[PDB]
């Protein structure tokens, strides 16, 4: 079933222009999402700690970035990075242009 779940985590990027994953008590991964809001753009808030499949959903997600947290930054069916990219591109203007279109 691990494939069935992951299949949804990869589609969530297409079903939503901007989607970010996080948890209940996991810093760094939550802040990256707070940036979008301040970017005058809209995004979806999803917490693997409150999801029924928080075990698997986060099992395949945590690997996406292989980080203690579940940081997921992907807008317009593209990868941003985070922990340096999502933060830099913001002040660099590479992010504002992404969330706006690309």
Swiss-Prot record:
Residues of the Glutaredoxin domain: 6-102
Protein location: Cytoplasm; Nucleus; Microsome; Endoplasmic reticulum
Domain of life: Eukaryota
UniProt tissue specificity: Expressed preferentially in testis where it is found in spermatids and spermatocytes but not in sperm. In elongating spermatids, expressed at the site of mitochondrial sheath formation. Low levels in other tissues including heart, lung, liver, kidney, brain, muscle and prostate.
Protein family membership: Belongs to the class-I pyridine nucleotide-disulfide oxidoreductase family.
Role summary: Displays thioredoxin reductase, glutaredoxin and glutathione reductase activities. Catalyzes disulfide bond isomerization. Promotes disulfide bond formation between GPX4 and various sperm proteins and may play a role in sperm maturation by promoting formation of sperm structural components.
Domain commentary: The N-terminal glutaredoxin domain does not contain the C-X-X-C redox-active motif normally found in glutaredoxins but activity may be mediated through a single cysteine. The C-terminal Cys-Sec motif of one subunit of the homodimer may transfer electrons from the thiol-disulfide center to the glutaredoxin domain of the other subunit.
Note, other: The thioredoxin reductase active site is a redox-active disulfide bond. The selenocysteine residue is also essential for catalytic activity.
Subunit structure: Homodimer.
Protein name (Swiss-Prot/TrEMBL): Thioredoxin reductase 3
């Amino acid at each position: 079933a691990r494939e069935e779940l992951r299949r949804r985590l990869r589609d969530l990027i297409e079903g939503n222009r901007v989607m970010i994953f996080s948890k209940s008590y996991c810093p760094h991964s939550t802040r990256v999402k707070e940036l979008f809001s301040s970017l005058g753009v809209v995004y979806n808030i999803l917490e693997l700690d409150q999801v029924d499949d928080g075990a698997s959903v986060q099992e395949v997600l945590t690997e996406i970035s292989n980080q203690k947290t579940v940081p997921n930054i992907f807008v317009n069916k593209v990868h941003v990075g985070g922990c340096d990219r999502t933060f830099q591109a913001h002040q660099n203007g590479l992010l504002q242009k992404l969330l706006q279109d690309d």
